[PDB]
């Protein structure tokens, strides 16, 4: 009674980190995926730019 | 028909917990694995962006 | 001829300018992306 | 020496001629590849954006699907 209670305290523990971890690795993707919208928006734009250049070539 | 009972409850929490913790540690390997794809996909277009600027600075010279 | 040099060298001085703003757009792009890398690398403790 | 100079000044000319020939050559070569950089690079850029589209799908599935 003893040993168990330290050994499912641990385990507790350990899947309460992991639950916070997970939590903060997915506002990372979530960040991840506006700075490759903002990534494609730039790219995009440089795309018009140069479409706009080459039709008068 | 209680420290029977109780230990039960225990032992079935302890699989619970124990069970949880491996299906967060699969969900954290699948969002570190889709971080890594996008860095080396990241260098991978680093790496074409650089060959890129190269062929137009033969061109410019 | 004369006036067709003349054309052609004008085309050329306009058409390498373009090329130098890319390559300075090109120069960008790479840092950004750089950038990006560096904190994924990071994130990745 | 006068008859003679101004022969002299048309053989000039016919080298002059020749080297303005030779240089629209070289400035139409130059124009050409010029133009076909610019060319490639916006394909590049057309499948640069298109494989950063993909990241963001594969980003997206991982974080909307769930086992
Ligand atoms: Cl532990
Ligand atoms: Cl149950
Ligand atoms: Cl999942």
Same mark, same amino acid.
């Given at each position: %009674? #003893? %040993?168990? $209670? &330290?050994? +499912? +305290? $641990?385990? %507790?523990? *350990?899947? *309460?980190? &992991?639950?916070?971890? &997970?939590?903060?690795?997915?506002?990372?993707? #979530?960040?991840? @995926?506006?700075?490759? =919208?903002?990534?494609?928006?730039?790219?995009? $734009? =440089? @795309? =018009? *730019?140069?479409?706009?250049?080459?039709?008068?070539?």
């Amino acid at each position: %009674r #003893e %040993r168990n $209670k &330290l050994a +499912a +305290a $641990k385990c %507790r523990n *350990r899947r *309460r980190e &992991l639950t916070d971890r &997970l939590q903060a690795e997915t506002d990372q993707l #979530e960040e991840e @995926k506006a700075e490759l =919208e903002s990534e494609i928006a730039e790219l995009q $734009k =440089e @795309k =018009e *730019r140069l479409e706009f250049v080459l039709v008068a070539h």
